[PDB]
Design a protein around this ligand. Structure first.
Ligand code: 37T
Length: 114
């Protein structure tokens, strides 16, 4: 059920999303900008292992379209994106190191929800 605080909490989520996409974090956010193109990258098992792909452009579309009804729904998708990275790749992969840094940006600012 919708709460009067949901619009304002979703604005905080939108601010986080804008930050994740910003130049400040681009050195480690870039693998998460667009859907994984598994065929182009030679990752021919990606869709056998990752049943629910997610990326920041999809989060952005869902925000713009008012798909997310509350902050928890938004956070679940961002976390799904990171989890997919932790599931698919070995833990010493550079993309995992980038995911951990971007997730730290996300989690610390999400925790500051007004
Ligand atoms: C999210 N993303 C974007 N590019 C990649 C990945 C990944 O998980 N593994 C991986 O190997 N590559 C190249």
């Amino acid at each position: 059920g919708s709460h009067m605080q949901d619009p304002e909490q979703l604005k905080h989520c939108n601010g986080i999303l804008k930050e994740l996409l910003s130049k400040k974090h681009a050195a480690y956010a870039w693998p998460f900008y667009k859907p994984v193109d598994a065929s182009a990258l030679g990752l021919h098992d990606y869709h056998d292992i990752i049943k629910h792909p997610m990326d920041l452009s999809t989060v952005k579309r869902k925000m713009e379209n008012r798909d997310y009804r509350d902050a928890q729904e938004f956070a679940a998708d961002v976390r799904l994106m990171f989890s997919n990275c932790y599931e698919y790749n070995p833990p010493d992969h550079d993309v995992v190191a980038m995911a951990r840094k971007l997730q730290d940006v996300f989690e610390f600012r999400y925790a500051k929800m007004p």
